[PDB]
Design a protein around this ligand. Structure first.
Ligand code: GDP
Ligand code: A1AK8
Ligand code: MG
Length: 167
């Protein structure tokens, strides 16, 4: 069946592991070693079609590793994640997006900007700010909460649909 290679990038602490574990396993994890990089798998149905998702959840110390580069080159779509309560993580988005364009040597790369931790009231990044950034990159912006599951499926399936159309 059709397989999709997705990569979740963003500053440490933004919820990459929580988002991926929520999608794959339907559990919210509040204590996941931030140094663990791992690939996750799940069969899902998207628009009536069964497909296999392969998802790389990234750890900071592997950023410039050869193995990370292999996964990035073969990756087909990228979630760029920040937390809506952490301005620094939002400021960092350009760094992750720049690395993707470099490794793929392309402007036409499926990506979604993800604003996570939407269930937290102490917001510091406005949705309008993130939509403007998303617009400037030509990508969708999806609000998520790994805790409540808000937008989790939407974020990953939107990326899959982007890849599906890109193919
Ligand atoms: N309230 C809330 N906490 C979250 C959310 N996503 C992640 N977290 C928490 O943020 C911390 C870091 O998340 P983690 O998945 O380890 O981030 P990573 O470093 O990007 O993998 C953990 O304490 C998680 O419980 C969310 O959507 N809502
Ligand atoms: S890894 O051990 O090279 C690995 C584990 C599971 C799946 C894959 S993959 O062939 O599907 N490549 C990939 C690339 C980007 C994001 C996820 C998976 C590789
Ligand atoms: Mg993690």
């Amino acid at each position: 069946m059709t397989e999709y290679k997705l990569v979740v990038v963003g500053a440490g602490g933004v919820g990459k592991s929580a988002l991926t574990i929520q999608l794959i396993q339907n559990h919210f994890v509040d204590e996941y070693d931030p140094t663990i990089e791992d690939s996750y798998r799940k069969q899902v149905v998207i628009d009536g079609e069964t497909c296999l998702l392969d998802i790389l959840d990234t750890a900071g110390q592997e950023e410039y590793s050869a193995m990370r580069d292999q996964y990035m080159r073969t990756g087909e779509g990228f979630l760029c994640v920040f937390a809506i309560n952490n301005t620094k993580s939002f400021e960092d988005i350009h760094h992750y997006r720049e690395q993707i364009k470099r490794v793929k040597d392309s402007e036409d790369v499926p990506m979604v900007l993800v604003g996570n931790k939407s269930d937290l009231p102490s917001r510091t990044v406005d949705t309008k700010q993130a939509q403007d950034l998303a617009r400037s990159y030509g990508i969708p912006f999806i609000e998520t909460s790994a805790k409540t599951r808000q937008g989790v499926d939407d974020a990953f399936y939107t990326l899959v649909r982007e890849i599906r159309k890109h193919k």
